[PDB]
Amino acid sequence: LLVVKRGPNAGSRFLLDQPTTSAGRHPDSDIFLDDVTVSRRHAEFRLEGGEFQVVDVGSLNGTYVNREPVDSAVLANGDEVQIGKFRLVFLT
Amino acid sequence: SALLVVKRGPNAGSRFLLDQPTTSAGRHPDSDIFLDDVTVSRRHAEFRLEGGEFQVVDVGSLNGTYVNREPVDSAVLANGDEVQIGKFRLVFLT
Amino acid sequence: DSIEDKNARVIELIAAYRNRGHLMADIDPLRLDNTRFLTLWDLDREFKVVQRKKLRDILSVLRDAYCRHVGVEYTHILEPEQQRWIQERVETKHDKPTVAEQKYILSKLNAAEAFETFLQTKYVGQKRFSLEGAETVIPMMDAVIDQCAEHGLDEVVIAMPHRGRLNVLANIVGKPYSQIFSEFEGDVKYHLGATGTYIQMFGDNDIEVSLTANPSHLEAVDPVLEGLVRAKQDLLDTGEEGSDNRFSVVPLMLHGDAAFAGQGVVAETLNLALLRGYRTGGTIHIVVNNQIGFTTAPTDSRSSEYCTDVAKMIGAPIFHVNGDDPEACAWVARLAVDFRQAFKKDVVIDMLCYRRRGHNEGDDPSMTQPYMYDVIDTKRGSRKAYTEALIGRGDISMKEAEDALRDYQGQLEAVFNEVRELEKHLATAVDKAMLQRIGDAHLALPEGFTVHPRVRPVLEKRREMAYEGRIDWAFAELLALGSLIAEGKLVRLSGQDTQRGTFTQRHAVIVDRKTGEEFTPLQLLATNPDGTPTGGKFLVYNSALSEFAAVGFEYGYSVGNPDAMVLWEAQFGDFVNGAQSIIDEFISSGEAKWGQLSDVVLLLPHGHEGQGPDHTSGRIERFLQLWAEGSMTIAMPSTPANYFHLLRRHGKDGIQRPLIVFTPKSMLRNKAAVSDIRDFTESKFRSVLEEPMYTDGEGDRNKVTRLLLTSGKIYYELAARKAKENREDVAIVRIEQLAPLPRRRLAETLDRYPNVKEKFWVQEEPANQGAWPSFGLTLPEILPDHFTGLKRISRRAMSAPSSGSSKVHAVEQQEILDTAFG
Amino acid sequence: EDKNARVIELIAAYRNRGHLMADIDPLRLDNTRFLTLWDLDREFKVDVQRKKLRDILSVLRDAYCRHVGVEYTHILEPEQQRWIQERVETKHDKPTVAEQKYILSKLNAAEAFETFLQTKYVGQKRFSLEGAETVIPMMDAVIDQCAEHGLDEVVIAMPHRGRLNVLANIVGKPYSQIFSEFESGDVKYHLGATGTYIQMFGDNDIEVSLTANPSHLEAVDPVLEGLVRAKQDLLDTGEEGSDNRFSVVPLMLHGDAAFAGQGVVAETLNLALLRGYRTGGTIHIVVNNQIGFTTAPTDSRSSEYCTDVAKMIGAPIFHVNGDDPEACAWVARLAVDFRQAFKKDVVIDMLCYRRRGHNEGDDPSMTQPYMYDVIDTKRGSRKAYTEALIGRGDISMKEAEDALRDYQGQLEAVFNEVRELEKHPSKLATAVDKAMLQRIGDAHLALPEGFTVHPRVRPVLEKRREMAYEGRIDWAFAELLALGSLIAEGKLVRLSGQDTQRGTFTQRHAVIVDRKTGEEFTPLQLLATNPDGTPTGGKFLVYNSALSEFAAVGFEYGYSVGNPDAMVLWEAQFGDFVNGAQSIIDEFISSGEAKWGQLSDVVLLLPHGHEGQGPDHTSGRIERFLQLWAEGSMTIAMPSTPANYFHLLRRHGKDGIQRPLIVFTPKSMLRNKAAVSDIRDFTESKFRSVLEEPMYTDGEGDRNKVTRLLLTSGKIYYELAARKAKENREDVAIVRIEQLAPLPRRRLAETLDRYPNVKEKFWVQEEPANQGAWPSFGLTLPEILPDHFTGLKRISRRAMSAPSSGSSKVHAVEQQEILDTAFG
Numbered sequence A: 001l002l003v004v005k006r007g008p009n010a011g012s013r014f015l016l017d018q019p020t021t022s023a024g025r026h027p028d029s030d031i032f033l034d035d036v037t038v039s040r041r042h043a044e045f046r047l048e049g050g051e052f053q054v055v056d057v058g059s060l061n062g063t064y065v066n067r068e069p070v071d072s073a074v075l076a077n078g079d080e081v082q083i084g085k086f087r088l089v090f091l092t
Numbered sequence B: 001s002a003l004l005v006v007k008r009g010p011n012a013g014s015r016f017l018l019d020q021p022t023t024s025a026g027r028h029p030d031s032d033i034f035l036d037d038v039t040v041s042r043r044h045a046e047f048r049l050e051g052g053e054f055q056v057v058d059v060g061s062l063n064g065t066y067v068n069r070e071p072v073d074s075a076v077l078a079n080g081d082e083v084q085i086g087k088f089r090l091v092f093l094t
Numbered sequence C: 001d002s003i004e005d006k007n008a009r010v011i012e013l014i015a016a017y018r019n020r021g022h023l024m025a026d027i028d029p030l031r032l033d034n035t036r037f038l039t040l041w042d043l044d045r046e047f048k049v050v051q052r053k054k055l056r057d058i059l060s061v062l063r064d065a066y067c068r069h070v071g072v073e074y075t076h077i078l079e080p081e082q083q084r085w086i087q088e089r090v091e092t093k094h095d096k097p098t099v100a101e102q103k104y105i106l107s108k109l110n111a112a113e114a115f116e117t118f119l120q121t122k123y124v125g126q127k128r129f130s131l132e133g134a135e136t137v138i139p140m141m142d143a144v145i146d147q148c149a150e151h152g153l154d155e156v157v158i159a160m161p162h163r164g165r166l167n168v169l170a171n172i173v174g175k176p177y178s179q180i181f182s183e184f185e186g187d188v189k190y191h192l193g194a195t196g197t198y199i200q201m202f203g204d205n206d207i208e209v210s211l212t213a214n215p216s217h218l219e220a221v222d223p224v225l226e227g228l229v230r231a232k233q234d235l236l237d238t239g240e241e242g243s244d245n246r247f248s249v250v251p252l253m254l255h256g257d258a259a260f261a262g263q264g265v266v267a268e269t270l271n272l273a274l275l276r277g278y279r280t281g282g283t284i285h286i287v288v289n290n291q292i293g294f295t296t297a298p299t300d301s302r303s304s305e306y307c308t309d310v311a312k313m314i315g316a317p318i319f320h321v322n323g324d325d326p327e328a329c330a331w332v333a334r335l336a337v338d339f340r341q342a343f344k345k346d347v348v349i350d351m352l353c354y355r356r357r358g359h360n361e362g363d364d365p366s367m368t369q370p371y372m373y374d375v376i377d378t379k380r381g382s383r384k385a386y387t388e389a390l391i392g393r394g395d396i397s398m399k400e401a402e403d404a405l406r407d408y409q410g411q412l413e414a415v416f417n418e419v420r421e422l423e424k425h426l427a428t429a430v431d432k433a434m435l436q437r438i439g440d441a442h443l444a445l446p447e448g449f450t451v452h453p454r455v456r457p458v459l460e461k462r463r464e465m466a467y468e469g470r471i472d473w474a475f476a477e478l479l480a481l482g483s484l485i486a487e488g489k490l491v492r493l494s495g496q497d498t499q500r501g502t503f504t505q506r507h508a509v510i511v512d513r514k515t516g517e518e519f520t521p522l523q524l525l526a527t528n529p530d531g532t533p534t535g536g537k538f539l540v541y542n543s544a545l546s547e548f549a550a551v552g553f554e555y556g557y558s559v560g561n562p563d564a565m566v567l568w569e570a571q572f573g574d575f576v577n578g579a580q581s582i583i584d585e586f587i588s589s590g591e592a593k594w595g596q597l598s599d600v601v602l603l604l605p606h607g608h609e610g611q612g613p614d615h616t617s618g619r620i621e622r623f624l625q626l627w628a629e630g631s632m633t634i635a636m637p638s639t640p641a642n643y644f645h646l647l648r649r650h651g652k653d654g655i656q657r658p659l660i661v662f663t664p665k666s667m668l669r670n671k672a673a674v675s676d677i678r679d680f681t682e683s684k685f686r687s688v689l690e691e692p693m694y695t696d697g698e699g700d701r702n703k704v705t706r707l708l709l710t711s712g713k714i715y716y717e718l719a720a721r722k723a724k725e726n727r728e729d730v731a732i733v734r735i736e737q738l739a740p741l742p743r744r745r746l747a748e749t750l751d752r753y754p755n756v757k758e759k760f761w762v763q764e765e766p767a768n769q770g771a772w773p774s775f776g777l778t779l780p781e782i783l784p785d786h787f788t789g790l791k792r793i794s795r796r797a798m799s800a801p802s803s804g805s806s807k808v809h810a811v812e813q814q815e816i817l818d819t820a821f822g
Numbered sequence D: 001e002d003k004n005a006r007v008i009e010l011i012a013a014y015r016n017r018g019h020l021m022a023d024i025d026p027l028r029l030d031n032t033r034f035l036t037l038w039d040l041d042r043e044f045k046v047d048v049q050r051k052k053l054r055d056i057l058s059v060l061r062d063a064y065c066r067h068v069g070v071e072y073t074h075i076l077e078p079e080q081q082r083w084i085q086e087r088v089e090t091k092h093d094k095p096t097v098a099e100q101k102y103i104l105s106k107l108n109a110a111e112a113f114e115t116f117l118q119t120k121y122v123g124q125k126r127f128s129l130e131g132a133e134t135v136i137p138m139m140d141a142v143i144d145q146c147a148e149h150g151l152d153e154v155v156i157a158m159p160h161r162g163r164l165n166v167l168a169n170i171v172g173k174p175y176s177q178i179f180s181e182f183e184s185g186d187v188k189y190h191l192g193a194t195g196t197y198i199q200m201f202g203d204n205d206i207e208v209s210l211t212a213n214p215s216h217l218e219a220v221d222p223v224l225e226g227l228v229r230a231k232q233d234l235l236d237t238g239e240e241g242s243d244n245r246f247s248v249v250p251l252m253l254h255g256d257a258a259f260a261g262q263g264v265v266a267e268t269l270n271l272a273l274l275r276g277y278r279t280g281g282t283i284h285i286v287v288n289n290q291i292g293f294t295t296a297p298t299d300s301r302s303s304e305y306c307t308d309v310a311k312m313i314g315a316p317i318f319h320v321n322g323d324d325p326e327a328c329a330w331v332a333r334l335a336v337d338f339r340q341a342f343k344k345d346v347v348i349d350m351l352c353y354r355r356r357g358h359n360e361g362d363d364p365s366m367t368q369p370y371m372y373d374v375i376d377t378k379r380g381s382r383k384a385y386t387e388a389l390i391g392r393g394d395i396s397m398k399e400a401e402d403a404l405r406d407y408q409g410q411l412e413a414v415f416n417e418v419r420e421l422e423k424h425p426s427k428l429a430t431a432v433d434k435a436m437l438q439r440i441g442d443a444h445l446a447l448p449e450g451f452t453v454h455p456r457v458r459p460v461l462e463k464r465r466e467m468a469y470e471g472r473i474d475w476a477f478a479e480l481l482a483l484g485s486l487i488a489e490g491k492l493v494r495l496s497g498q499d500t501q502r503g504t505f506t507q508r509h510a511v512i513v514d515r516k517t518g519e520e521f522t523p524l525q526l527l528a529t530n531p532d533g534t535p536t537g538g539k540f541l542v543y544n545s546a547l548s549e550f551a552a553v554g555f556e557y558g559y560s561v562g563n564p565d566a567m568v569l570w571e572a573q574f575g576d577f578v579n580g581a582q583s584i585i586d587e588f589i590s591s592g593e594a595k596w597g598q599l600s601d602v603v604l605l606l607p608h609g610h611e612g613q614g615p616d617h618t619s620g621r622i623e624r625f626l627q628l629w630a631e632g633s634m635t636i637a638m639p640s641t642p643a644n645y646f647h648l649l650r651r652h653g654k655d656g657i658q659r660p661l662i663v664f665t666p667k668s669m670l671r672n673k674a675a676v677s678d679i680r681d682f683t684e685s686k687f688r689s690v691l692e693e694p695m696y697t698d699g700e701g702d703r704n705k706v707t708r709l710l711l712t713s714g715k716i717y718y719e720l721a722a723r724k725a726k727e728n729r730e731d732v733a734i735v736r737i738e739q740l741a742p743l744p745r746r747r748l749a750e751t752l753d754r755y756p757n758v759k760e761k762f763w764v765q766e767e768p769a770n771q772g773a774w775p776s777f778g779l780t781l782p783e784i785l786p787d788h789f790t791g792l793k794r795i796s797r798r799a800m801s802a803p804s805s806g807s808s809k810v811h812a813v814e815q816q817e818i819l820d821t822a823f824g
């Protein structure tokens, strides 16, 4: 589960219950993050077995996990994910 | 008898005859030669004739009296001399 | 030459770079002026600066600080601590921006260029508003707002002209494309106000970002922006009339190079920057300097080196920056905010750029500027140039450049997609206690205060009037303002010498005869008898000697705080023509054009008294000509009580509409022009007034065969002539509210005079002025059974408001009275 | 080494900031206003000289910290900084006794005049120069220095304070004229004047003049500049002259609060170095009495000095102590020398005080108790200077008595004279021949050798030759035909405005730019030379203005006043921006003749018309100009044809009458193919104040079939005419009123009598009902012509608080509604 803590859609929740969950500015994204700071294809939330992973898929402004830039990271309960100006918290 | 011609001033070209013992020149409206300008004191100068000899005398003006561009208290005038009273320039002729 | 001679030249060289290095800086992205750009053995010699440095190292610091992409002007500043602050931040080795910061700037350049491409591709006639060649103003503005959010400020209020406005709306204010382009046809959207929330990309804060409405009149909005920001600061209790000195509402004023140098309102507005009644704690100015003004070259636009030189008027630091360097642009923007925060003073950013397209459609700018446009045709876009520079320096990889390109395509798709989806589908009366409390306030002087001997009788007369009557005009005004403050209203009153009053009548502020200390009697009404605050306040000021900037500011203030009572007073109404652009473009028309509401009051001293054509008229006729239903209230009250009710009605009606009042001069001291206590406690505003002999006396209206309709002070002279001749056949009716015309009240009043055989509109003004041009035409139309055959009695038509002779005035005045009773 | 670095920085500190410590305030209101001791006798190298620190300090304190505060290190030109430095950092020769006595004589006249004014009349306190009398020897020193450079004229602009004093003691006007039928006060506080100044010590005379002005402070500033520029162009001096002397000098006076608060000050400074507006430098004098009515300087400005705006153009600023008339006269002479050397503005801030209150009965201690308790201790400038001369031994007690007698006499001179005083339209042809049209057409193709025309400009040049010989003359060419024929007849034509060289609507091309070199070519300048090679005396002065309305309109009004024989035209980008110059329109253009007898022939060109471009690109506010009009003040027109515009301009330029002309000009009508004129309209016609449809004047139209008359003005005529042609509406006629003011009453009556079967008349206009010509015509036409216009109805847009709707779709719907109503 992902809850938006910062952004125009603050308080919005998104369920992570698929192998791949796309997050970006593309209107067909599983998590549509509508802002100029978010690339059309920005990140993906990948589920393999019991672990949830965030993957940057070539965005301009990058993907941050707990205020650190990442290419890919294994997510853990309470982690903050930053996609453009959006700040999301990952919950179990 | 002598003449004063105004060469510089609002009344340029004007002529004044010097044919009496004293001829007053100043801003006082009763002057024999009324020189109407802020640079001319109410009582400025006098042209004094005695025995065919003409003399210019400063009678306590603020801006003084000049004869041939030199400041004077009194001077014996001679044909062609330039007298300056305030901004007015007059030539003395015989 | 010795070491002593060498030193003297080194210190002079350091001063030369600090003073004039900006003249050599690489600030022009077009490099149009080619001519723009101690011995060699001295380079390795050390010199005292309390450091020791080689001349080559001194030169290196000076050239990097003053001669690269930033030209700094600051040695003109008179405050040495301000010069030192700039010097310390400019004469240091700078830390290169991180890759994340560079990519963020690129993301903003991507959004700026994608928006311009959309605008120029989807619609016709957008070329004139194009930001192409000046796109770096978007990451610059973003850096200004982000730095304000970094200081934890509350709001940034923007004012700007058309160029890049829709770009700013989307990429700075954050408005959705569906709202920006909603029913898009230039468009009215280029003039409308907006609000949004800015979220820091790298920090913890948010900040409100707004944009004020404006006409096409370049720079006219500058003082409106200042007033709006001040009104918001006063509400947030920040700044000059606030408990904190944060000035947490920031004006961000955008300009063009030709307009900034040529429009006098720029100087008038800069002149307000440190004034107690007008300061906003410093404005951030951005000049979009594309080195052209339509077809006009800078040499025909200004008489100085820079378009920003007017800002030297108030000792503002000036930063000339190269628009092709977005990192230098963002850095200058952050430094400007820091300086504004440290010293509460204006900062000017001159962004040197170019205008890629022609000024209008079909316009080939090489017709008048062939050299500039042959150079522009070789320039690559700001985004492609910045992308290539990042690759060249190795700041980003080719894979990251491809990421940036895909981001740009996505920015383009986002706007085209959304627009594609959009195209598819109350009593004003007060009690006696209230009057008495305002009267008593005038004598509740601080302990040890020394009233001037000529002011003391005014204070005592006001207590006397409050309890016994014969209330004069000046006291009735303070009774209105004072009762509003006691009811919790903020009252802001200003104008030239407005604290005392031009005619020594107001005394809103009284000055101690021995110490110069000030006392404001109406401020005592901000506190209830029990000691609790009412929430009300009296903000009264003497303005600068301006009409355009001052009227603009008061309009702006009323827009920023709709709950405030805002009054601007002209010295004489004859000088309000200096603010004609504010009257025409904002006050009279802003509601119909932009939905922007204002309750601003204009007080215009008016009346024919023989003081000449510049001390007679507030031009009633011009304000009546501008009027249209629901735009303004226009009045000329004849009694102090009617003025009192007019102001209280204006302040309590819950309607935001400007009020224009033609106020008196000699009628201030007319003993017949006084009001009874009953008029304040048991009456209301009277749009139409009858003579007291009919309402309070034994006058017989049925004897009246000639009706005189009028307005203002001439009423008293007409009434005196009627009393003198005992003329019961003549009645005088006053129209107190000139607009909207009180049609119903006027018809009901005239019906009370059944035997009227002739009607005249009587006025002091020339026939082509005053109320006659509009009333002569409108009254027979809206009331044909009352005003058909209506005739005029006035001064003859004149090209000036009056004669320049007081003797001619007196003869003309008597002629009007003689004609009225002939 | 560390000591030299300190000494050099100390020298720079005095040069940059010594003015902040100078003894400039005669009231000394601010008390807080004002390397070791062993270093005082150490020698240091200075620019190459060797001087003791005490001697360096002595030169610096004398140059920068005495009665003169010098501001010049802000100047970007180093040669200008060096010039000031050399004249300020030298030991000055004390004035001679004759010079000191001359200054005293001028202080005597200034104070004697003020005493007279305050003693003889009531209500003169507001205009008092008491406490600022030193501005008279200062102004006298400015004019004397201009005469010393052998210049032709000094033209003064100033507000009310000390005006009658200036009239008498500077301009040299007699008391019998100044005080004639004496009563903002008397009208003489606003009137213009001319006189001749004679040097007291030199060989030259210089004309001195004073321009008229309203009470609107600083509004006259750009009018002064225009007048000076027009006089300079006449004397072939300055920018458009064979010499670079700029031999006509603007002397601009101001007050401290107005100089800092009025935007027109910055707008006017901004013109100072422009090719179309420069006058070779203005001498500014600020009468800084450190008050503005009841307002303290802290509420008037956001800067240290009231003069800080002049830093905009890098002007040197001299703050001088008004209690030191020698320093004041010296600063005045240095200012003239700097203006002569660099052709740039100089500002003199004269610090003084206001002895009396700003109004009668007004005690200024009510609002400024501290300042006025200090002023009450101040002795008069004249008594103070007389006493100082005695104390220093410059004059004897006998000479002090001479000075006192002089003062008493200055007093008597004015009282005695006043007591004695108290006891006592050409209508010649505007038509030109075919050869004249062809010559102006051919000029457009007579390009300099090697000139490269822009490919989009070349067809415009060729079309003008084609139109000149074959007809269908468009609006833009008809204008240049008018201006060109006037230049060929020997007239000076000055045309300016925003982007006026090319034209806002790319229609004028008065100046064409070489595609390869940027060199300029002006086709109409070829008309300043006759076919035989001799000059006509005519000239074409065409410029792109600054982005100003107030200063630019003021300048053009001023220019026409300065040269009544010039054709002067100012063009608005859109007529909607002329409200920025409302103070010039109201205070000068529309009213100056009735108020001051000051005449102007200035032309205002205002692009106007409802085309759906919004409320700031639609109206020049015809209604405001018609409201301002009164008989003989202005001509107001809205021509519908290029030939009628041509004749209107030629009538205006050749009538020998100095009266402003207001023209509501077209935008889309510039390219309206029906809005073209035949050659015969230029060669065999004249200006037509009222126009009928050509089918009645030239065709076979039957006026007797007309039952509905449509009276209108401007471009809507063509839309009305095309709707009449489409529907063959013989029952409807369209009459145009080309001249809106003065109303062509007799011509309009004679025209309407030609339609005997008319049963209804309508005034048709694009503008909202409360705008355009309807508010004045709806009221005036039924009164001036009751047998023709009783029952006259209006067809227009509904009344609006703005000139138009902000929607082009709403515009188009409203435009069609007017046409449908007109033919309903």
Ligand SMILES: Cc1ncc(C[n+]2csc(CCOP(=O)(O)OP(=O)(O)O)c2C)c(N)n1
Residues within 6 Å of the ligand: C163, C216, C217, C218, C219, C255, C256, C257, C258, C259, C260, C288, C290, C292, C293, C294, C355, D498, D547, D573, D577, D580
């Ligand atoms: C007060 C005013 N006067 C005139 C105009 C007409 N006008 C529109 S754009 C323009 C030139 C603007 O030049 P600049 O300030 O450099 O801005 P740019 O268009 O170059 O951004 C002018 C004169 C206007 N809109 N407002």
Ligand SMILES: Cc1ncc(C[n+]2csc(CCOP(=O)(O)OP(=O)(O)O)c2C)c(N)n1
Residues within 6 Å of the ligand: C496, C545, C571, C575, C578, D161, D215, D216, D217, D218, D254, D255, D256, D257, D258, D259, D287, D289, D291, D292, D293, D354
């Ligand atoms: C444009 C304009 N606005 C207002 C006024 C009203 N007014 C007359 S005198 C005065 C103050 C003048 O102050 P300052 O410029 O210092 O001149 P001073 O009277 O001190 O010589 C004002 C506001 C005016 N005449 N013109």
Ligand SMILES: [Ca+2]
Residues within 6 Å of the ligand: C599, C649, C650, C651, C652, C653, C654, C655, C656, C657
């Ligand atoms: Ca209200």
Ligand SMILES: [Ca+2]
Residues within 6 Å of the ligand: D601, D651, D652, D653, D654, D655, D656, D657, D658, D659
């Ligand atoms: Ca004429």
Ligand SMILES: [Mg+2]
Residues within 6 Å of the ligand: C256, C257, C258, C288, C289, C290, C291, C292, C293, C294
């Ligand atoms: Mg520009």
Ligand SMILES: [Mg+2]
Residues within 6 Å of the ligand: D255, D256, D257, D287, D288, D289, D290, D291, D292, D293
């Ligand atoms: Mg003053």
